[PDB]
Amino acid sequence: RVAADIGAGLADALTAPLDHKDKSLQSLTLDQSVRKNEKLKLAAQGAEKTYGNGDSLNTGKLKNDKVSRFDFIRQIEVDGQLITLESGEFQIYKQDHSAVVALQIEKINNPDKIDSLINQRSFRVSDLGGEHTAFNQLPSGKAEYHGKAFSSDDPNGRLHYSIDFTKKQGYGRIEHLKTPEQNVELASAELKADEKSHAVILGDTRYGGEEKGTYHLALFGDRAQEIAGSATVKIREKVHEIGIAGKQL
Ligand SMILES: [Mg+2]
Ligand SMILES: [Mg+2]
């Protein structure tokens, strides 16, 4: 009930201009969710907007600490035809300094009939952004983060994570997902700078006392108020992706 209470933010995000006085995070650049030859149509609450690579999503209009959901289609022009490559649901979790996007795919183009769709489900974490914390401007001390872990058909996992800025080390946990084996250790890993000199943590996921995949957490906010990113976990023969985001209380 509370999770489903997203106000009128979906229609508003699709139809309103960026207003930097709106509640932060005010916008997210869409880069991973739509590639340069593609277009992404998001629809909800009676509205629709077309996005291309590099376009801004107006997260300022969306509810904080909730997953906002949009129906999407992904299209491309190929050989004189407008082809739908994917259709599904675009899920975005909004915080004060950060946002993370996951895509639940429902249909893809038929590989043998490109202008028709077939059912084929998958789930991936795509865009991740906000006010990145500069690695050279990290806060002092330590911090604990609480928030959401969301995977395919399961938005009710929890994230708990601890960073010691002085030791430049982080570790944490994914809890409460319905699939037991998704509730991985986010094993201790080094806090370091990425290519853009942003503070990030790249670590292993573990379950059953073995490595099962990797996780990526980026720090956001001038005091690293928040973290957001993704985790992968291999369960049987399949790799599962999990969106994760949290904030200091
Ligand atoms: Mg544009
Ligand atoms: Mg930067």
PDB file of N, CA, C and O in Angstrom, residues 63-92:
ATOM      1  N   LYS A  63       8.561  10.537  -5.993  1.00  0.00           N
ATOM      2  CA  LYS A  63       8.608  10.350  -4.548  1.00  0.00           C
ATOM      3  C   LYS A  63       9.949   9.806  -4.091  1.00  0.00           C
ATOM      4  O   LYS A  63      10.496   8.894  -4.691  1.00  0.00           O
ATOM      5  N   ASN A  64      10.465  10.355  -3.003  1.00  0.00           N
ATOM      6  CA  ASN A  64      11.710   9.855  -2.429  1.00  0.00           C
ATOM      7  C   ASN A  64      11.512   8.532  -1.689  1.00  0.00           C
ATOM      8  O   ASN A  64      10.442   8.271  -1.124  1.00  0.00           O
ATOM      9  N   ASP A  65      12.551   7.704  -1.732  1.00  0.00           N
ATOM     10  CA  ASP A  65      12.596   6.401  -1.044  1.00  0.00           C
ATOM     11  C   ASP A  65      11.516   5.452  -1.519  1.00  0.00           C
ATOM     12  O   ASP A  65      11.076   4.579  -0.767  1.00  0.00           O
ATOM     13  N   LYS A  66      11.082   5.627  -2.762  1.00  0.00           N
ATOM     14  CA  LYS A  66      10.153   4.696  -3.375  1.00  0.00           C
ATOM     15  C   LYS A  66      10.620   4.287  -4.760  1.00  0.00           C
ATOM     16  O   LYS A  66      11.375   5.005  -5.414  1.00  0.00           O
ATOM     17  N   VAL A  67      10.173   3.117  -5.187  1.00  0.00           N
ATOM     18  CA  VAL A  67      10.353   2.710  -6.567  1.00  0.00           C
ATOM     19  C   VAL A  67       9.215   3.285  -7.397  1.00  0.00           C
ATOM     20  O   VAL A  67       8.031   2.971  -7.168  1.00  0.00           O
ATOM     21  N   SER A  68       9.560   4.142  -8.351  1.00  0.00           N
ATOM     22  CA  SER A  68       8.577   4.617  -9.304  1.00  0.00           C
ATOM     23  C   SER A  68       8.668   3.774 -10.561  1.00  0.00           C
ATOM     24  O   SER A  68       9.765   3.477 -11.014  1.00  0.00           O
ATOM     25  N   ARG A  69       7.517   3.423 -11.121  1.00  0.00           N
ATOM     26  CA  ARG A  69       7.477   2.482 -12.245  1.00  0.00           C
ATOM     27  C   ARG A  69       6.846   3.075 -13.493  1.00  0.00           C
ATOM     28  O   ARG A  69       5.782   3.693 -13.434  1.00  0.00           O
ATOM     29  N   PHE A  70       7.489   2.828 -14.633  1.00  0.00           N
ATOM     30  CA  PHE A  70       6.997   3.280 -15.928  1.00  0.00           C
ATOM     31  C   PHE A  70       6.938   2.101 -16.879  1.00  0.00           C
ATOM     32  O   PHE A  70       7.846   1.267 -16.884  1.00  0.00           O
ATOM     33  N   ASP A  71       5.891   2.024 -17.690  1.00  0.00           N
ATOM     34  CA  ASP A  71       5.887   1.068 -18.807  1.00  0.00           C
ATOM     35  C   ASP A  71       6.876   1.591 -19.847  1.00  0.00           C
ATOM     36  O   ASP A  71       6.925   2.789 -20.093  1.00  0.00           O
ATOM     37  N   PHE A  72       7.685   0.731 -20.462  1.00  0.00           N
ATOM     38  CA  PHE A  72       8.582   1.265 -21.474  1.00  0.00           C
ATOM     39  C   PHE A  72       8.543   0.434 -22.743  1.00  0.00           C
ATOM     40  O   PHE A  72       8.226  -0.763 -22.710  1.00  0.00           O
ATOM     41  N   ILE A  73       8.854   1.088 -23.858  1.00  0.00           N
ATOM     42  CA  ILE A  73       9.260   0.354 -25.047  1.00  0.00           C
ATOM     43  C   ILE A  73      10.582   0.947 -25.532  1.00  0.00           C
ATOM     44  O   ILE A  73      10.845   2.149 -25.387  1.00  0.00           O
ATOM     45  N   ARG A  74      11.434   0.077 -26.060  1.00  0.00           N
ATOM     46  CA  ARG A  74      12.718   0.484 -26.600  1.00  0.00           C
ATOM     47  C   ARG A  74      12.668   0.240 -28.076  1.00  0.00           C
ATOM     48  O   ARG A  74      12.364  -0.878 -28.501  1.00  0.00           O
ATOM     49  N   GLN A  75      12.946   1.272 -28.861  1.00  0.00           N
ATOM     50  CA  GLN A  75      12.838   1.141 -30.309  1.00  0.00           C
ATOM     51  C   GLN A  75      14.122   1.538 -31.004  1.00  0.00           C
ATOM     52  O   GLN A  75      14.956   2.252 -30.446  1.00  0.00           O
ATOM     53  N   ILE A  76      14.259   1.050 -32.231  1.00  0.00           N
ATOM     54  CA  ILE A  76      15.392   1.391 -33.088  1.00  0.00           C
ATOM     55  C   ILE A  76      14.929   1.394 -34.543  1.00  0.00           C
ATOM     56  O   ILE A  76      14.021   0.637 -34.895  1.00  0.00           O
ATOM     57  N   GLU A  77      15.478   2.290 -35.365  1.00  0.00           N
ATOM     58  CA  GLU A  77      15.220   2.274 -36.804  1.00  0.00           C
ATOM     59  C   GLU A  77      16.221   1.315 -37.448  1.00  0.00           C
ATOM     60  O   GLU A  77      17.437   1.488 -37.304  1.00  0.00           O
ATOM     61  N   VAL A  78      15.709   0.286 -38.122  1.00  0.00           N
ATOM     62  CA  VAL A  78      16.561  -0.690 -38.820  1.00  0.00           C
ATOM     63  C   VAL A  78      15.963  -0.967 -40.191  1.00  0.00           C
ATOM     64  O   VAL A  78      14.806  -1.368 -40.288  1.00  0.00           O
ATOM     65  N   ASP A  79      16.768  -0.789 -41.237  1.00  0.00           N
ATOM     66  CA  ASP A  79      16.357  -1.125 -42.591  1.00  0.00           C
ATOM     67  C   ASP A  79      14.987  -0.551 -42.924  1.00  0.00           C
ATOM     68  O   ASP A  79      14.115  -1.263 -43.417  1.00  0.00           O
ATOM     69  N   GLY A  80      14.805   0.733 -42.633  1.00  0.00           N
ATOM     70  CA  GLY A  80      13.588   1.432 -43.009  1.00  0.00           C
ATOM     71  C   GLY A  80      12.388   1.136 -42.124  1.00  0.00           C
ATOM     72  O   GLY A  80      11.264   1.498 -42.467  1.00  0.00           O
ATOM     73  N   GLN A  81      12.615   0.480 -40.987  1.00  0.00           N
ATOM     74  CA  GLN A  81      11.504   0.058 -40.128  1.00  0.00           C
ATOM     75  C   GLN A  81      11.758   0.471 -38.699  1.00  0.00           C
ATOM     76  O   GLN A  81      12.894   0.423 -38.231  1.00  0.00           O
ATOM     77  N   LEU A  82      10.695   0.861 -38.001  1.00  0.00           N
ATOM     78  CA  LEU A  82      10.798   1.161 -36.583  1.00  0.00           C
ATOM     79  C   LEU A  82      10.527  -0.113 -35.795  1.00  0.00           C
ATOM     80  O   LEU A  82       9.392  -0.580 -35.744  1.00  0.00           O
ATOM     81  N   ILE A  83      11.575  -0.657 -35.190  1.00  0.00           N
ATOM     82  CA  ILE A  83      11.530  -1.939 -34.485  1.00  0.00           C
ATOM     83  C   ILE A  83      11.485  -1.767 -32.971  1.00  0.00           C
ATOM     84  O   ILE A  83      12.294  -1.021 -32.417  1.00  0.00           O
ATOM     85  N   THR A  84      10.545  -2.444 -32.305  1.00  0.00           N
ATOM     86  CA  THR A  84      10.601  -2.524 -30.847  1.00  0.00           C
ATOM     87  C   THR A  84      11.521  -3.667 -30.441  1.00  0.00           C
ATOM     88  O   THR A  84      11.245  -4.842 -30.730  1.00  0.00           O
ATOM     89  N   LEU A  85      12.615  -3.315 -29.774  1.00  0.00           N
ATOM     90  CA  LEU A  85      13.599  -4.287 -29.307  1.00  0.00           C
ATOM     91  C   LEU A  85      13.182  -4.950 -28.007  1.00  0.00           C
ATOM     92  O   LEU A  85      13.393  -6.151 -27.804  1.00  0.00           O
ATOM     93  N   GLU A  86      12.631  -4.142 -27.109  1.00  0.00           N
ATOM     94  CA  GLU A  86      12.234  -4.602 -25.782  1.00  0.00           C
ATOM     95  C   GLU A  86      10.995  -3.865 -25.332  1.00  0.00           C
ATOM     96  O   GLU A  86      10.801  -2.703 -25.686  1.00  0.00           O
ATOM     97  N   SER A  87      10.162  -4.532 -24.543  1.00  0.00           N
ATOM     98  CA  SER A  87       9.156  -3.794 -23.784  1.00  0.00           C
ATOM     99  C   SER A  87       9.126  -4.339 -22.371  1.00  0.00           C
ATOM    100  O   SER A  87       9.501  -5.488 -22.116  1.00  0.00           O
ATOM    101  N   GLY A  88       8.725  -3.508 -21.417  1.00  0.00           N
ATOM    102  CA  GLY A  88       8.727  -3.974 -20.048  1.00  0.00           C
ATOM    103  C   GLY A  88       8.423  -2.860 -19.079  1.00  0.00           C
ATOM    104  O   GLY A  88       7.625  -1.987 -19.390  1.00  0.00           O
ATOM    105  N   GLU A  89       9.056  -2.921 -17.908  1.00  0.00           N
ATOM    106  CA  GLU A  89       8.891  -1.910 -16.863  1.00  0.00           C
ATOM    107  C   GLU A  89      10.231  -1.331 -16.441  1.00  0.00           C
ATOM    108  O   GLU A  89      11.229  -2.036 -16.211  1.00  0.00           O
ATOM    109  N   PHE A  90      10.231  -0.011 -16.363  1.00  0.00           N
ATOM    110  CA  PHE A  90      11.363   0.804 -15.983  1.00  0.00           C
ATOM    111  C   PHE A  90      11.175   1.144 -14.512  1.00  0.00           C
ATOM    112  O   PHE A  90      10.202   1.798 -14.160  1.00  0.00           O
ATOM    113  N   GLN A  91      12.084   0.683 -13.653  1.00  0.00           N
ATOM    114  CA  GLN A  91      11.928   0.879 -12.207  1.00  0.00           C
ATOM    115  C   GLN A  91      12.996   1.840 -11.709  1.00  0.00           C
ATOM    116  O   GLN A  91      14.177   1.596 -11.942  1.00  0.00           O
ATOM    117  N   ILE A  92      12.616   2.930 -11.040  1.00  0.00           N
ATOM    118  CA  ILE A  92      13.660   3.807 -10.546  1.00  0.00           C
ATOM    119  C   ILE A  92      13.459   4.093  -9.073  1.00  0.00           C
ATOM    120  O   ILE A  92      12.358   4.453  -8.635  1.00  0.00           O
TER     121      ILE A  92
END
